[PDB]
């Protein structure tokens, strides 16, 4: 784990290594946006946004409740996550941030992943894999 | 101090100790209401919002930036908060949180103030005065 070693990584900041692609989902009717997200992406989590070009984020959504929403459209009958749940407004990270803060947002304190952010903006999602990758290089 | 022994910090939550009138400001062009935020409440850092009908916590501004913006707008001559220094809501709170969780995010980061958000729409504000009261009452 981080810190002690030859000194060079004391320099590095979150923008220098964070992955730029976007598991976002729009606050709109289209199950096609959901289908495309579920096709293109995998793992625990997605982000919910006001619109693709405004890029304000509300919170996080996970594969089971969205494939169950698709399941609700699939049900024998003839998008609104607020009918069930939408999860906590998480931490965020600002582009300049040094690793020695970011380590103490996921540890000594329990959180799994973080959205990198700017004023009203979503830049991407960080995970422990990028983090421990960045610690080691 | 943290409290070792007989406590009800596990009984009671951020929703109980909440305070709700706040120095918030719209993204709007007019300065006629910015005049209120100068004295209608007392405090250092304000709550910038995406709309008086949405109240997403876009970020925070110190009085010395906004008073200088008014000093320029009423300079001897015959909106633009956008190019002052701004910071997004650095951490945010949700009603079901017990006092102990809050104490750790305050103390571990040296953050002086925080906002309650639920998902998006603000509910109220917190400072070192509220907790240093409520941990004894």
Residue numbers in the entry:
A (entry chain A), B (entry chain B): 567 to 644, 783 to 841
Original paper wording:
While the TM domain could be resolved to 2.7 Å, the CTD exhibited poor density compared to the apo sample and did not allow us to confidently model the CTD when masking the whole protein for refinement. To improve the density quality, we masked the CTD only for refinement; this masking provided an acceptable density map at 4 Å and allowed us to confidently dock the CTD from apo structure. The orientation of the CTD in the AK-42-bound structure is the same as observed in the apo structure that shows N-terminal hairpin binding; the density for the J-K helix is weaker than in the apo dataset, but still sufficient to allow modeling of the helix.
CLC-2 is a voltage-gated chloride channel that contributes to electrical excitability and ion homeostasis in many different tissues. Among the nine mammalian CLC homologs, CLC-2 is uniquely activated by hyperpolarization, rather than depolarization, of the plasma membrane. The TM region of CLC-2 displays a typical CLC family symmetric homodimeric structure, with each subunit containing an independent Cl− pathway.
